[PDB]
Amino acid sequence: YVRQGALIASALIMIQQTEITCPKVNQFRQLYSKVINDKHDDVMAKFGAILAQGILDAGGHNVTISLQ
Amino acid sequence: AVDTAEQVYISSLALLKMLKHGRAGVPMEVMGLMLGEFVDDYTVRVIDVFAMPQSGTGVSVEAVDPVFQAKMLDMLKQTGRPEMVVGWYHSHPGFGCWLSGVDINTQQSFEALSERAVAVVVDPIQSVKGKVVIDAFRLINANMMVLGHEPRQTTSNLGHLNKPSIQALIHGLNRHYYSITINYRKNELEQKMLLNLHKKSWMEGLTLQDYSEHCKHNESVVKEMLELAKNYNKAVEEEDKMTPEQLAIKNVGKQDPKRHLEEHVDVLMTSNIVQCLAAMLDTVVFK
Amino acid sequence: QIVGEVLKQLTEEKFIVKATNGPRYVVGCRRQLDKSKLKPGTRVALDMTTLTIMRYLPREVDPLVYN
Amino acid sequence: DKKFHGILDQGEGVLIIFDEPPVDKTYEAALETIQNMSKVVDSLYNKAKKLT
Amino acid sequence: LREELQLLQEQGSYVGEVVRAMDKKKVLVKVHPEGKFVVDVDKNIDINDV
Amino acid sequence: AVQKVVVHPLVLLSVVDHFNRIGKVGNQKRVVGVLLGSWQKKVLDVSNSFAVPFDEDDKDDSVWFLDHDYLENMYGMFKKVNARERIVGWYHTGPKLHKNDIAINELMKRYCPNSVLVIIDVKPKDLGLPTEAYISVEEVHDDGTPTSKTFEHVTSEIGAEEAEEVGVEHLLRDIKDTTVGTLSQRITNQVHGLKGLNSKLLDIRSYLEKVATGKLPINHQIIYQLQDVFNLLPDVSLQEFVKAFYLKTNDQMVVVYLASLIRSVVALHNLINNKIANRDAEKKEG
Amino acid sequence: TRPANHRQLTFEEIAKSAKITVNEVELLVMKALSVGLVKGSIDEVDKRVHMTWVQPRVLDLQQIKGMKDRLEFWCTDVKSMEMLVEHQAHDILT
Amino acid sequence: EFLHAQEEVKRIQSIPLVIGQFLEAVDQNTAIVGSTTGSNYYVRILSTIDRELLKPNASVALHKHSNALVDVLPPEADSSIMMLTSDQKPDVMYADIGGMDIQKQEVREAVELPLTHFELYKQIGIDPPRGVLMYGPPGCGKTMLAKAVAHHTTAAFIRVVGSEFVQKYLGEGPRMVRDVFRLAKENAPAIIFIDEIDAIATKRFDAQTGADREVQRILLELLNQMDGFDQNVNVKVIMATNRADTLDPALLRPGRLDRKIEFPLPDRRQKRLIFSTIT
Numbered sequence A: 001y002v003r004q005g006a007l008i009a010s011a012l013i014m015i016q017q018t019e020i021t022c023p024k025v026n027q028f029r030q031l032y033s034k035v036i037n038d039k040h041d042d043v044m045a046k047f048g049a050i051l052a053q054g055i056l057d058a059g060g061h062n063v064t065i066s067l068q
Numbered sequence B: 001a002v003d004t005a006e007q008v009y010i011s012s013l014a015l016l017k018m019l020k021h022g023r024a025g026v027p028m029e030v031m032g033l034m035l036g037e038f039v040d041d042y043t044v045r046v047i048d049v050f051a052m053p054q055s056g057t058g059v060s061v062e063a064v065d066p067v068f069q070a071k072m073l074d075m076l077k078q079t080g081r082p083e084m085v086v087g088w089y090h091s092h093p094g095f096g097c098w099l100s101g102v103d104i105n106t107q108q109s110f111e112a113l114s115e116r117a118v119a120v121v122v123d124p125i126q127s128v129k130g131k132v133v134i135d136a137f138r139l140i141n142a143n144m145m146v147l148g149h150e151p152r153q154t155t156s157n158l159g160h161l162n163k164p165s166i167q168a169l170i171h172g173l174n175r176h177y178y179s180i181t182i183n184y185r186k187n188e189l190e191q192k193m194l195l196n197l198h199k200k201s202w203m204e205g206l207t208l209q210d211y212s213e214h215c216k217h218n219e220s221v222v223k224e225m226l227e228l229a230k231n232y233n234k235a236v237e238e239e240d241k242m243t244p245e246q247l248a249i250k251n252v253g254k255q256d257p258k259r260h261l262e263e264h265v266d267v268l269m270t271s272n273i274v275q276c277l278a279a280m281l282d283t284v285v286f287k
Numbered sequence C: 001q002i003v004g005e006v007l008k009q010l011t012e013e014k015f016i017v018k019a020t021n022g023p024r025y026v027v028g029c030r031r032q033l034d035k036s037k038l039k040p041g042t043r044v045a046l047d048m049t050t051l052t053i054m055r056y057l058p059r060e061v062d063p064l065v066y067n
Numbered sequence D: 001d002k003k004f005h006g007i008l009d010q011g012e013g014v015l016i017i018f019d020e021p022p023v024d025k026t027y028e029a030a031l032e033t034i035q036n037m038s039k040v041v042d043s044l045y046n047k048a049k050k051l052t
Numbered sequence E: 001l002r003e004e005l006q007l008l009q010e011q012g013s014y015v016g017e018v019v020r021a022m023d024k025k026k027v028l029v030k031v032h033p034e035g036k037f038v039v040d041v042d043k044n045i046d047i048n049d050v
Numbered sequence F: 001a002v003q004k005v006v007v008h009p010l011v012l013l014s015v016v017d018h019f020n021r022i023g024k025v026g027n028q029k030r031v032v033g034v035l036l037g038s039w040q041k042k043v044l045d046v047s048n049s050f051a052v053p054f055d056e057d058d059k060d061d062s063v064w065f066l067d068h069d070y071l072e073n074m075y076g077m078f079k080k081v082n083a084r085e086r087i088v089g090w091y092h093t094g095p096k097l098h099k100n101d102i103a104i105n106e107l108m109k110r111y112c113p114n115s116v117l118v119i120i121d122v123k124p125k126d127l128g129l130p131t132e133a134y135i136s137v138e139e140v141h142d143d144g145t146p147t148s149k150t151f152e153h154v155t156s157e158i159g160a161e162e163a164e165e166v167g168v169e170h171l172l173r174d175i176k177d178t179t180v181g182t183l184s185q186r187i188t189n190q191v192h193g194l195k196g197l198n199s200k201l202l203d204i205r206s207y208l209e210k211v212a213t214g215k216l217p218i219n220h221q222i223i224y225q226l227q228d229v230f231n232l233l234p235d236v237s238l239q240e241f242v243k244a245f246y247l248k249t250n251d252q253m254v255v256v257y258l259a260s261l262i263r264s265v266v267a268l269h270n271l272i273n274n275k276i277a278n279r280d281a282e283k284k285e286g
Numbered sequence G: 001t002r003p004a005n006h007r008q009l010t011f012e013e014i015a016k017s018a019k020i021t022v023n024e025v026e027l028l029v030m031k032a033l034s035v036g037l038v039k040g041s042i043d044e045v046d047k048r049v050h051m052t053w054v055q056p057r058v059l060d061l062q063q064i065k066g067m068k069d070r071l072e073f074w075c076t077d078v079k080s081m082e083m084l085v086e087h088q089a090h091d092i093l094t
Numbered sequence H: 001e002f003l004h005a006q007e008e009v010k011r012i013q014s015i016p017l018v019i020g021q022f023l024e025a026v027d028q029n030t031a032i033v034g035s036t037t038g039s040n041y042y043v044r045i046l047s048t049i050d051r052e053l054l055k056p057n058a059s060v061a062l063h064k065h066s067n068a069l070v071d072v073l074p075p076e077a078d079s080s081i082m083m084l085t086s087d088q089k090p091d092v093m094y095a096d097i098g099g100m101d102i103q104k105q106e107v108r109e110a111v112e113l114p115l116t117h118f119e120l121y122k123q124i125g126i127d128p129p130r131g132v133l134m135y136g137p138p139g140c141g142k143t144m145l146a147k148a149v150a151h152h153t154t155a156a157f158i159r160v161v162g163s164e165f166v167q168k169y170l171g172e173g174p175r176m177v178r179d180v181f182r183l184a185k186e187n188a189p190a191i192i193f194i195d196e197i198d199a200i201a202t203k204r205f206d207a208q209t210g211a212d213r214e215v216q217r218i219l220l221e222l223l224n225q226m227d228g229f230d231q232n233v234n235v236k237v238i239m240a241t242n243r244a245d246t247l248d249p250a251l252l253r254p255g256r257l258d259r260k261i262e263f264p265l266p267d268r269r270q271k272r273l274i275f276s277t278i279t
């Protein structure tokens, strides 16, 4: 549950931003792709990974959730 | 056919009855039924539990005597508080969080009688110091597996700290439907009563004990720290000029600087000062 | 109680009691009994589950032939 | 030869016999610990690492 | 370390003298108390790792 | 007749819950039942509890009822499931004891010859007392005093039931009522020990003051017999500290040499090692 | 009356208390030890009798003010020292 | 809070332990142990106890239901009794023996290694003997040389007793050989004295009858231990036998056991000397 929470948080920080902000952006996106394609992970970890992918690609780099 | 992330509000006295009953009949695999009520589908609450002697036959439905159970229920209704039967408990010294074949059969009979009749495994011998095991599951029919299996419903709660044992996994139970989450009725007027009264040390902090065993204890302390003297000696001539961590990893000695740390010396110092302060406090009280 | 022998007294708190058929355990002693009553190499009884000394018993041997 | 526990007070023409308490060996043991835990370490270590 | 003590509460692991490494992730092994106990292979070690 | 009783941390919460569950409709404040257990070596212990609804009237304290058939059936079931358990006494809440206790004791003593009374404070948690024990002694109040009831308190101490340590640790898991954090924990031990000593001795002083005023009957015949020795015991003579000027002060000064210095030296060793590492890192980083 | 406050029961004090001779002091204190009045040490170089009593009796409940005052003196001393050590211990308890 | 947590997590129970002998520390956080009933099983070693008492083949303590490495028991002699430190005790000194010599010069040669002289074994270039087998009848006592010598030069003396050793504790037989060898290695002045080899311990002419294979395995581990000794310290090993014919060649061959001494019958002149000495 901490792993999936970290994945969701890393997706949330990475919404609406590309690799120009940090070179790790592409690394985390491919990390999300390989963990969502990895179906031998725990139920909770996979659930958070997919929610992380959804919030990251929310609307197709079109909408975002910001507190500012 | 709905079993969400269900939670059992088990009571402390139910725990005490469980441990007492198990401690009495450790090798007999004593049986009992968990007196609980389904206030709703998944927020099951158990306030009381009883102890029943396992008949000589062993794990049998007739061992739980029906007339005796009815008389016990009537006695609870007259004196105390009535409570339904929707569960059972069993000290299980043989192996862990799963059920034996006969336990599965009698739980199937209980499921036919009740609505769920949760299967609770409590190991009396494995619970020794910190870990008491109370795992509850449900038996399922063949239809649950042919439909969308893992009857665990759509929520992210029963996946929290859900680690079924290997023997539970290889058995149907704890694998048929789900593993039930446990909770303790730590309500106030009950929990504050327990912490205030049961674990009672209230005027026992005034003990003096200056030298009851402490003169020879100090002799032993000096001898132990003389061994620390040799150890911390040994360390200072080891002290090699090749990044001493490299020397230390391959030449661990568990010495005063490494493992017999300052914590132990602090324990000796605390013991001395505590006896000092107690003696001095009572000396100034002595007026 | 299971029957064992005092394989080693070890110390005042922990004792080595060996069952007659294999395993030996580092167990405690009965509260009422004392080390002078336990002694090394004397038959004792361990608790079946908690594995602690419960009572010490004398032993006998018999040739049982032409007696 | 420490076979007796007393002091000969010739001025008074007597010998004062005292019961020596021997439980005070913690004192000497503590001194030995002080000596063999401090001398062997502080001088050697902080003379080897003079510069810091 | 406490969990290791609890894992060890089931003897922890069991020593086995590996003999035959079958292709289907199967090792025959030998255990001193009893002897041979045919079992699967762990995930960290492949079939050829045996 | 028993020397003393020892209460387990096993029946106190059960009694309190029984009070709570049967007080929903019975607001008499008076919960009366039986405590079952065992008495083996002049030490009486309680292992099980049971509550019965119970109504009182202030008129001579003789209006009441119980379910004796159900209670006896309970006892038979409890003995059947565990033979060593036996009724060690009967308990009543409401520490302000009334007069029906003698009739209840007379009726229930057919189960236990040395009938005893137990009071459980469900709501009160005054200092640490969960319950109190009472022994029935009507064999003449004193040598030169008239007849009375005189229910005395047999000494009670909270026992240590086995296998409940796991459950209580899991239950609380928040306060950790153990010697953890030795220095601070013992400071707290000294703190509430002084609190308990001050509170109880203030209570004794208040009792002496109220005896002096004479508003309450004076049980002096045991009060001065027990407190005179307490007062006259010579713990105020300081010449034994003179004889033992080094009572432990030698151990105090060796600990100063060998705990505080040792902590200072090991801390010094850690700092100078860190300083060497930091200086080398700063010089050789580039 | 004196909780070891005057623990020096000299011969002159004994004479004031009992109007008895010097040789009878030995028998009187002997019988006192036998019955249980005083169980302390009996010297003769200074004739000091140590004070322990294990046979209490009526303490003139009209004069209970004396023991009440001594008990409240103990209460004040204990509370004062508890507050003093609290003052010395604010650096940990506050 | 973290000091409180650190001092709270340091409970480690460890009161109701059991004994199952350690085999060897393969690495850190991994190990292999052998319980009393056998059941050799790989375990995880906690960091609380380590090399300070983690000697390779010493009996250790394991938790009741967990078999986990918790403590290592220091003593080794009283694990299976089989005699103990007969040192520091004059029972029969040396010259007070009635048997005079028989030879006793090869025995003083055998005590040369306990009588220091390991330094003199080098430099001069000699190779001191390591084993001494005495294939004599109860004549000369055959243990008055080992009760003595051990006191002539202060050294530990162990009766071993071969007849007792062959028993149900055949699986623990290797472990007890390791323990007694460790007791010897602990005290460089120590001599092992084994008795009653001929009739029970590895007779070589009668076929293996049931537990005889177990005796052969126990002897094999004894050879393993005596070869692991390899003159590491100045401890000596002496077996006493009535007839060496049935003994196994592995012990009998040179390189493990060389000095064969026969202690004959009272030797009427020596017999009269024995009578005078005893009287």
Ligand SMILES: Nc1ncnc2c1ncn2[C@@H]1O[C@H](COP(=O)(O)OP(=O)(O)O)[C@@H](O)[C@H]1O
Pocket (backbone or CB within 6 Å): H096, H097, H098, H099, H136, H137, H138, H139, H140, H141, H142, H143, H144, H195, H196, H240, H274, H277, H278
């Ligand atoms: N001075 C002595 N010289 C020779 N033998 C002695 C002397 N004193 C005692 N003995 C005897 O030597 C015997 C040793 O016998 P034992 O150890 O059984 O023989 P083995 O070593 O061949 O088994 C003792 O029983 C003892 O009576």
